[PDB]
């Protein structure tokens, strides 16, 4: 904890689709549950992620 550098988080609306990133099945499903139609989750048949 550095009071000179106090961590916060700013809510922003995504203005452009971000590059896809890998995630687990459960993690991706949680992301889909949160964002609804504002996220796309797709299985990778090569590794099942």
């Amino acid at each position: 904890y550095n009071p000179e550098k106090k961590e916060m988080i700013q809510e922003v609306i995504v203005e452009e689709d971000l590059e896809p990133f890998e995630a687990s099945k459960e993690t991706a499903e949680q992301f889909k549950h949160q964002h609804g139609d504002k996220v796309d989750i797709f299985e990778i048949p090569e590794t099942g992620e």
Partner: protein, 49 residues
């Protein structure tokens, strides 16, 4: 790939739209097949046929 995504964004083309529809339809297939499997477990193969 990046150039293709840029062009798709400009064209307002949803590359994932067919995939999303396919997964929705696959879930529909799974639920209808669950219904048919239940009716087959209930009435039996001989009765249903």
């Amino acid at each position: 790939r990046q150039q293709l995504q840029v062009l798709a964004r400009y064209l307002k083309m949803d590359l994932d739209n067919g995939e999303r529809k396919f997964l929705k339809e696959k879930d529909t297939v799974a639920e209808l097949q669950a219904q048919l499997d239940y009716l087959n477990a209930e009435l039996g193969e001989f009765f249903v046929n």
